[PDB]
């Protein structure tokens, strides 16, 4: 287990205004706890991503319909 | 070009204390301009990464010896 690592944080400072369709989303990532701010990250198709604010209804409803994104190692 | 996207920011709030060997690094990523803080991200082997503070000598010397990380699309 190679760990010279001090990872970067994934933060959401700007958020999706327009509702993203559920069909367009693969999974979600939670933002880093240091810069949390109730943001969520939806993994879209072809490598794309979108920050979404979890205090908004459609974000909560979508989050409840998707699993957390998996990671490599 | 699918863009429903509002990307997350890559930030560096904690930094590498111990110097990472140049041989262990593939390239570097600059942090997002919103949360810049003079941090740098070094891409390590087997998917790993490390935040490094660009006001420190070894970080500046290493940065000058590596190219910027490429991206998919
Ligand atoms: C995701 O955010 C929720 C709050 O909405 C929190 O309870 C949880 O610990 C976070 N999970 C991860 C895996 O970061
Ligand atoms: C990287 O940081 C330098 C300052 O050290 C800045 O001049 C530059 O605009 C940044 N480049 C990118 C590609 O983010």
Cα–Cα distance measured from residue B28 to residue B60, given in angstroms and rounded to the nearest whole number: 11
Cα–Cα distance measured from residue B35 to residue B47, given in angstroms and rounded to the nearest whole number: 23
What is the structure's resolution, reported in angstroms to one decimal? Answer: 2.1
Q: With an 8 Å Cβ cutoff, is A36 touching chain B?
A: no
Torsional class of B39: left (φ above 0), alpha (ψ -120 to 50), beta (otherwise):
beta
Q: Whose CA is nearest to atom 7 of ligand 1?
A: A30
Question: In this structure, which topology does domain A1-73 adopt according to CATH?
Answer: OB fold (Dihydrolipoamide Acetyltransferase, E2P) (2.40.50)
Cβ contact B5:B29 at 8 Å: no
Tokens read off for B64: 């000058």
Ligand nearest to the CA of A41: 1
Q: Which residues of B touch A52 (CB under 8 A)?
A: 6
Q: Where are the domains of chain B?
A: 1-73
Q: What percent of chain A is helix, strand and coil (3-state, nearest 5)? A: 15, 30, 55
Question: Considering only CA atoms, which of B34, B41, B31 is closest in space to residue B11?
Answer: B31
**Helix, strand, or coil (residue B64):** coil
Cα–Cα distance measured from residue A48 to residue B2, given in angstroms and rounded to the nearest whole number: 8
The residues, any chain, with a CB within 8 Å of residue A39's CB and separated by 6 or more, are: A11, A12, A13, A15, A31, A51, A52, A53, A54, B8
Q: A63, exposed or middle or buried, with CB in 10 Å at 0-12, 13-18, 19+?
A: middle
Which secondary structure element, helix H or strand E, spans residue A30, and what is its range? strand A25-30
Cα–Cα distances (Å) from B53 to B1, B16, B18, B49, in that order, read 35, 7, 11, 13
Experimental technique: X-ray
Cα–Cα distance measured from residue B67 to residue B27, given in angstroms and rounded to the nearest whole number: 5
Report which ligand 1 atom has the smallest distance to the Cα of A31: 14
């Amino acid at each position: 287990s190679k760990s010279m690592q001090v990872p970067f944080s994934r933060c959401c400072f700007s958020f999706a205004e327009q509702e993203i369709p559920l069909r367009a989303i693969l999974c979600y990532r939670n933002t880093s706890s240091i810069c949390s701010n109730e943001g969520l990250i939806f993994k879209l198709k072809r490598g794309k991503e979108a920050c979404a604010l979890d205090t908004v209804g459609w974000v909560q409803r979508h989050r409840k319909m998707l699993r957390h994104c998996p990671s490599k190692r």
